[PDB]
Scaffold this active site. Structure first.
Site, short mmCIF file in Angstrom:
data_model
loop_
_atom_site.label_atom_id
_atom_site.label_comp_id
_atom_site.label_asym_id
_atom_site.label_seq_id
_atom_site.Cartn_x
_atom_site.Cartn_y
_atom_site.Cartn_z
N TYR A 92 73.50 -40.28 -46.70
CA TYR A 92 72.35 -40.56 -45.55
C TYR A 92 71.77 -39.17 -45.56
CZ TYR A 92 70.44 -41.55 -40.93
OH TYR A 92 69.55 -41.76 -39.90
N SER B 163 67.39 -46.16 -44.65
CA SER B 163 66.45 -45.60 -43.34
C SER B 163 66.37 -44.02 -44.04
CB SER B 163 67.32 -45.55 -42.00
OG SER B 163 66.15 -45.21 -41.06
N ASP C 40 61.01 -55.03 -39.10
CA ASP C 40 61.41 -53.62 -38.94
C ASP C 40 60.55 -52.62 -37.99
OD1 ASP C 40 62.67 -51.20 -38.95
OD2 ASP C 40 63.25 -51.25 -41.29
N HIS D 162 65.31 -53.82 -38.62
CA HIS D 162 66.01 -52.55 -39.29
C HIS D 162 67.30 -52.74 -39.62
CE1 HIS D 162 65.79 -48.43 -40.55
NE2 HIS D 162 66.88 -48.20 -39.53
C1 LIG Z 1 66.44 -44.24 -40.00
N1 LIG Z 1 67.43 -43.50 -40.28
C2 LIG Z 1 65.39 -44.04 -39.23
C3 LIG Z 1 64.17 -43.18 -39.91
C4 LIG Z 1 64.34 -41.73 -39.81
C5 LIG Z 1 65.48 -41.56 -38.57
N2 LIG Z 1 65.65 -43.00 -38.04
C6 LIG Z 1 66.40 -43.35 -37.06
O1 LIG Z 1 66.56 -44.73 -36.62
C7 LIG Z 1 66.87 -42.47 -36.00
C8 LIG Z 1 68.21 -41.44 -36.62
C9 LIG Z 1 69.05 -42.14 -35.51
N3 LIG Z 1 69.34 -43.46 -36.14
N4 LIG Z 1 70.42 -43.62 -37.02
N5 LIG Z 1 71.55 -43.73 -37.78
C10 LIG Z 1 68.36 -42.72 -34.13
N6 LIG Z 1 67.11 -42.81 -34.76
C11 LIG Z 1 66.06 -43.28 -33.75
O2 LIG Z 1 64.78 -43.26 -34.39
C12 LIG Z 1 66.36 -43.63 -32.64
C13 LIG Z 1 64.84 -43.82 -31.80
C14 LIG Z 1 65.21 -44.09 -30.19
C15 LIG Z 1 65.31 -42.60 -29.75
C16 LIG Z 1 64.38 -41.54 -29.99
C17 LIG Z 1 64.67 -40.20 -29.36
C18 LIG Z 1 65.96 -40.03 -28.72
C19 LIG Z 1 66.82 -41.09 -28.58
C20 LIG Z 1 66.60 -42.32 -28.84
#
Ligand SMILES: *C(=N)[C@@H]1CCCN1C(=O)[C@@H]1C[C@H](N=[N+]=N)CN1C(=O)CCCc1ccccc1
Length: 710
Positions: free
Chosen positions: A473, A554, A641, A680
């Site tokens: 990751y 992701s 997604d 997602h």
């Molecule tokens: C996939 N990894 C996507 C694309 C790059 C970052 N991504 C996320 O989903 C990120 C990373 C964490 N997920 N995981 N594992 C959480 N996240 C989010 O986008 C959460 C969105 C909601 C949020 C936004 C800001 C602060 C708190 C919560």
């Protein structure tokens, strides 16, 4: 082998944008519109070639049968007490969604409390978030449809499992926190927006607000309690202190582990919750994280990374709040990351550490921070826990690469503590003693030692002959710790494979310094670390480039896509799930603005210059050497997604097929599959999970010509 043709895909050669003097052409920009006939036709034409390719060989059927058999084992969550009753999740094995059960005691008969399976024919309505009232008599729960981040909150009275009329819409990335008077609940919502809000749209999400819903009223009556109109990216989540006196507001902007922390003493409200609360701005910056653990009067215990990258526990007294006065209850460790902390049975703390990517679990005294007890675990992860301040027992769940799981229970009212197995299930067909897990540390390009787990059959020859599946990751302070995957164990047992997980920089494995080592100007470290993990597996004789598959999702999809562009010679096969591919545009869509804390944003010349060098969309290039082609590649995404909008994978695959797919030397396939009624990944029904892993391993098997081993 290539019995299909890539579809013709229109190139808008007029789509040219200047980024700080650098011209960028984006000929598939039109794929950014998910609702157009052109985009729909593109997706259909892509699926038309991918699906027959995946389904042609008996291998997919063989894998699917074995996955269906081996994944069919009972799956439990920890028990948790709420008010007078106990609750737990349970899946008999192959139910699309796990089901919430209730019982009146630990010895008592259990009954169904909430069964999400009955909410859809195909298991595509899933629970996403829930909160019981403080007394356990009322229950709020979020439902998401087709795998979207969008939530509808509904309510039930616990006694009799009675559906209530209360419905909350426009909920996303929301807290759920009841006031202890049982009057109502805090939650978050977005303002109305043009177009759809079902997970198929790409619209950016801004101006999230904090509302209070009074039970028994319409949502239109809800009280606005906090808003940040001058700061559209701020998100304020509420929680009540354990004594019910204070609302604590954690404001985030982006994905870094930092927050502002404001509080409201509810006793100081002039007439209950009637509008914007009298917020006291205790911590009014984004310089550190403050995660509430518990309080005793005005003394608040927080887990923090403020000048403590491996985290620590501090006490801030609201009546003496200057930083020079904070007490360090549990100091930062030199190496081990304090992952999370809970308070249980009034005056105990449960601390979970990460020590070289394995969990340890300790009980400490709340008053002094002193260590009281070590809860013994095998090598692996703690993936569930229950035990709140007013509760007198804990449950925790352990998992590892080779073992499905053990739920432990400990009665904390006992003078001499004695944690006991509460639930354990073994998977028959996968004999764990036939395999082993090793941890090694390999040097990256710059000499930094990176951890990697390797799981393989005992006694194999390291002669380079084995197919390998290497996962990473590398981002967002996420630690990739040991977890039980039947799907990967089938690759080991029935495809003769070796599993590897590389704990590359960007992750949380060595705290905030590890995270900062894989972001912004240093994002290239992630790719270097992962390419070096592949080189280690090859050099040490686990595998060879032609037999090596890499996988990530992701941010991990970005990882593997970039690696395919940078070192196509290193990999036989690449599976990128729900990947961020357009690094110049990701911030424009849904919640992508939040990721700039890891990536930067192309509106800055400095950031653009980082991003352009590794953006998968912008670095597709025919390998110069005649004997080198791209690896076989499969992109997996889905039409709801709304976390990583699917236009990322759409534009990337169009580019791969045109630039590389058209070349005479390219014979490895470059394919996408776009699922329906999925997003997602969170909440994906079992049936779709099985189809997905069957697709992945059938692709690997066909591309690498791997024989099934029954
Ligand atoms: C996939 N990894 C996507 C694309 C790059 C970052 N991504 C996320 O989903 C990120 C990373 C964490 N997920 N995981 N594992 C959480 N996240 C989010 O986008 C959460 C969105 C909601 C949020 C936004 C800001 C602060 C708190 C919560």
């Amino acid at each position: 082998m290539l019995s299909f043709q890539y579809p013709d895909v229109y190139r808008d050669e007029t789509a040219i944008q200047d980024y700080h003097g650098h011209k960028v052409c984006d000929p598939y920009a039109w794929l950014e519109d998910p609702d157009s006939e052109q985009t729909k036709a593109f997706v259909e034409a892509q699926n038309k070639i991918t699906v027959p390719f995946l389904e042609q060989c008996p291998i997919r059927g063989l894998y699917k049968e074995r996955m269906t058999e081996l994944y069919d084992y009972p799956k439990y969550s920890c028990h948790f007490k709420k008010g007078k009753r106990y609750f737990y999740f349970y899946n008999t094995g192959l139910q699309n969604q796990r089901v919430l059960y209730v019982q009146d005691s630990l010895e008592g008969e259990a009954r169904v409390f909430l069964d999400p399976n009955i909410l859809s024919d195909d298991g595509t309505v899933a629970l996403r978030g829930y909160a019981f009232s403080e007394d356990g008599e009322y229950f709020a729960y979020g439902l998401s449809a087709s795998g979207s981040d969008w939530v509808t909150i509904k309510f039930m009275k616990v006694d009799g499992a009675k559906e209530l009329p209360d419905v909350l819409e426009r909920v996303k990335f929301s807290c759920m926190a009841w006031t202890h008077d049982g009057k109502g609940m805090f939650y978050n919502a977005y303002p109305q927006q043009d177009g759809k809000s079902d997970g198929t749209e790409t619209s950016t999400n801004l101006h999230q607000k904090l509302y209070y819903h009074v039970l028994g009223t319409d949502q239109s009556e809800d009280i606005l309690c906090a808003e940040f109109p001058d700061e559209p990216k701020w998100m304020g989540g509420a929680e009540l202190s354990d004594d019910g006196r204070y609302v604590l507001l954690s404001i985030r902007e982006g994905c870094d582990p930092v927050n502002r922390l404001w509080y409201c003493d509810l006793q100081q409200e002039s007439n209950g919750i009637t509008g914007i609360l009298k917020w006291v701005k205790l911590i009014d910056n984004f310089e550190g994280e403050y995660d509430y653990v518990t309080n005793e009067g005005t003394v608040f215990t927080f887990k923090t990374n403020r000048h403590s990258p491996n985290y620590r526990l501090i006490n801030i007294d609201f009546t003496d709040p200057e930083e020079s006065k904070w007490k360090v209850l549990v100091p930062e460790h030199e190496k081990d990351v304090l992952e999370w902390v809970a308070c249980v049975r009034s005056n105990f703390l449960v601390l979970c550490y990460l020590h070289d990517v394995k969990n340890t679990l300790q009980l400490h005294d709340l008053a002094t921070g002193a260590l009281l007890k070590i809860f013994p675990l095998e090598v692996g992860s703690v993936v569930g826990y229950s035990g709140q301040k007013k509760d007198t027992e804990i449950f925790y769940q352990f998992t590892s690469f080779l073992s499905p799981g053990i739920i432990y229970h400990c009665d904390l009212t006992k003078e001499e503590l004695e944690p006991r197995v509460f639930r354990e299930v073994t998977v028959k067909g996968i004999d764990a003693s036939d395999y082993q897990t090793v941890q090694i540390f390999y040097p990256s390009k710059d000499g930094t030692k990176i951890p990697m787990f390797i799981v393989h059959k005992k006694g194999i020859k390291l002669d380079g002959s084995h197919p390998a599946f290497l996962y990473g990751y590398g981002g967002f302070n996420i630690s990739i710790t040991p977890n039980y995957s039947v799907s990967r164990l089938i690759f080991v047992r029935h495809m003769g494979g070796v599993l590897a997980v590389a704990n590359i920089r960007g992750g949380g494995e060595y705290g905030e310094t590890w995270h900062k080592g894989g972001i912004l100007a240093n994002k290239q470290n992630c790719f270097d670390d992962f390419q070096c993990a592949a080189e280690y597996l090859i050099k040490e004789g686990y595998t060879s480039p032609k037999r090596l598959t890499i996988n990530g999702g992701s941010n991990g999809g970005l990882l593997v896509a970039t690696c395919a562009n940078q070192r196509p010679d290193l990999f036989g096969c690449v599976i990128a799930q729900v990947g961020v591919m357009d690094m110049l545009k990701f911030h424009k869509y849904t919640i992508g603005h939040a990721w700039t804390t890891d990536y930067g944003c192309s509106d800055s010349k400095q950031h653009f210059e980082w991003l352009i060098k590794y953006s998968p969309l912008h670095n597709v290039k025919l390998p110069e050497a005649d004997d080198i082609q791209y690896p076989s590649m499969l992109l997996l995404t889905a039409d709801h997604d709304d976390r990583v909008v699917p236009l990322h994978s759409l534009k990337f695959i169009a580019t791969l097929q045109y630039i590389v797919g058209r070349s005479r030397k390219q014979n490895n396939p470059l394919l996408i599959h776009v699922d329906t009624k999925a997003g997602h990944g969170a909440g994906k029904p079992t049936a779709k999970v099985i189809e997905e892993v069957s697709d992945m391993f059938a692709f690997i098997a066909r591309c690498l010509n791997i024989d099934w081993i029954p």
